[PDB]
Design a protein around this ligand. Structure first.
Ligand SMILES: Cc1ccc(S(N)(=O)=O)cc1
Length: 167
């Protein structure tokens, strides 16, 4: 049993909810929240900008030190950093950004990072300002992630479309 509430069950391991990932993290304090990161961990907008704002910029300060030491992530890659006030840990995962011309086949590699964690609160990778089709992102998620993932979708119109169209 876990703390996650109000989710619709899509499969054995994937759950979905119309929820504000920031507000959900603040309520649950999950072991792992996933960030929709870029390779530079520049948390300007989208999910990343919202998560970072909720940490009062502490996520960005930590991230800048990580990049100064290790250099940029790979598209499809990840790193584990602090969850600050939102979670124990933040798994920063880089999905391909279609608005930069990145290979959508890298979305499966991105979701494979989730399998290193037994339970996660996450957004749909490469959705929103990363430009991918969220219906596709949900299909790759279901077909790739084997650990227990709780997906948060802020916009009701998209949430309702994801559920209604789910095979
Ligand atoms: C209308 C809206 C949609 C998505 C988000 S976020 N910060 O989860 O990406 C916020 C507001």
């Amino acid at each position: 049993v876990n703390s996650f509430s109000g989710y619709l069950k899509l499969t054995d391991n994937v759950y979905i909810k119309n929820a504000d990932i920031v507000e959900e993290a603040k309520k649950v304090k999950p072991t792992v929240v996933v960030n929709a990161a870029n390779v530079y961990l520049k948390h300007g907008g989208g999910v990343a900008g919202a998560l970072n704002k909720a940490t009062n910029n502490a996520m960005q300060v930590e991230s800048d030190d990580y990049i100064a030491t290790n250099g940029p992530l790979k598209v499809g890659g990840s790193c584990v950093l602090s969850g600050h006030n939102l979670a124990k840990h933040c798994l920063h995962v880089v999905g391909p950004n279609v608005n930069k011309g990145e290979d959508i086949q890298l979305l499966k590699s991105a979701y494979e990072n989730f399998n290193q964690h037994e339970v996660l609160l996450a957004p749909l990778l490469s959705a929103g300002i990363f430009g991918a089709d969220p219906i596709h992102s949900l299909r790759v998620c279901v077909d790739t992630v084997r650990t227990n993932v709780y997906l948060a979708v802020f916009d009701k119109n998209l949430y309702d479309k994801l559920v209604s169209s789910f095979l």
